[PDB]
């Protein structure tokens, strides 16, 4: 059985648009993602998701709501990524471009799936339907899924 490391992912989802962040630099440049990072010692997962959103994008929120949980496994990496997925419609402030990340809104008929993580094509449609989900994806590298499971759940 592998060990897992906790991560967060926040989708800034409004009725007609979603805010995503593009990686500007390095391995994975050009890919659009929600906002998040590693959970730190002593914080709740939800508080870590809020902190990461603020650190990564400049945005604050009053509340998040949990919408999913996805485990990622990469070939060659013994540690699983346990990603806790949150969404909010209610944001404070404007998103900020950093040296690492450029934020941009996309209309919900222009979701840039080809330039997102491949798994997003599977679970983001559930998020748009206000469904909750559990997922697992095994990757060879950044582009290829070798195995995956996705299931709608009533409780995350």
Ligand X SMILES: Nc1[nH]c(=O)nc2c1ncn2[C@H]1C[C@H](O)[C@@H](COP(=O)(O)OP(=O)(O)OP(=O)(O)O)O1
| H or E element at residue 109 | none
Smallest gap, in angstroms, from Cβ of residue 36 to ligand X? 3
Q: How many residues bind ligand X (CB under 6 A)?
A: 12
Give the integer Cα–Cα distance in Å for 47 and 64.
9
Residue 38 is assigned to a ligand binding site: yes
| Exposed e or buried b per residue across 38-75, where buried means at least 16 C-beta atoms within 10 angstroms of its C-beta | ebeeeeebbebbbbbbbebbbbebeebeebbbbbbbee
Q: Which of 84, 119, 126, 132 binds ligand X (CB under 6 A)?
A: 119
Residue 8 is assigned to a ligand binding site: yes
If one asks whether residue 112 binds Na ion (CB under 5 A), the answer comes out as no
Q: Which of 6, 17, 31, 37 binds Na ion (CB under 5 A)?
A: 37
CB neighbourhood size of 31 (10 A): 17
Site map (CB under 6 A) of ligand X, residues 133-152, x = contact: --------------------
Stretch that binds ligand X, among 103-111, 114-122, 127-135, 147-155 (CB under 6 A): 114-122
Collect all residues with Cβ–Cβ distance below 8 Å to 119 and sequence separation of at least 6: 70, 72, 135, 137, 145, 148
Q: Interface with ligand X by CB under 6 A: which residues?
A: 7-9, 33, 36-38, 72, 83, 117, 119-120
């Amino acid at each position: 059985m592998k060990a897992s490391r906790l991560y967060t992912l926040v989708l800034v989802l409004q009725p007609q648009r979603v805010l995503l962040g593009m990686k500007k630099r390095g391995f994975g440049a050009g890919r659009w993602n929600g906002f998040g990072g590693k959970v730190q010692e002593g914080e709740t997962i939800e508080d870590g998701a809020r902190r990461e959103l603020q650190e990564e994008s400049g945005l604050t929120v009053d509340a998040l709501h949990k919408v999913g949980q996805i485990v990622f496994e990469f070939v060659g990496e013994p540690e699983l990524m346990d990603v806790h997925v949150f969404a909010t419609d209610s944001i404070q402030g404007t998103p900020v471009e950093s040296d690492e990340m450029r934020p941009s809104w996309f209309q919900l008929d222009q979701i840039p799936f080809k330039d997102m993580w491949p798994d997003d094509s599977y679970w983001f449609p559930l998020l748009l339907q206000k469904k909750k989900f559990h997922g697992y994806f095994k990757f060879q590298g950044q582009d290829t899924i070798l195995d995956y499971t996705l299931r709608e759940v009533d409780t995350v």
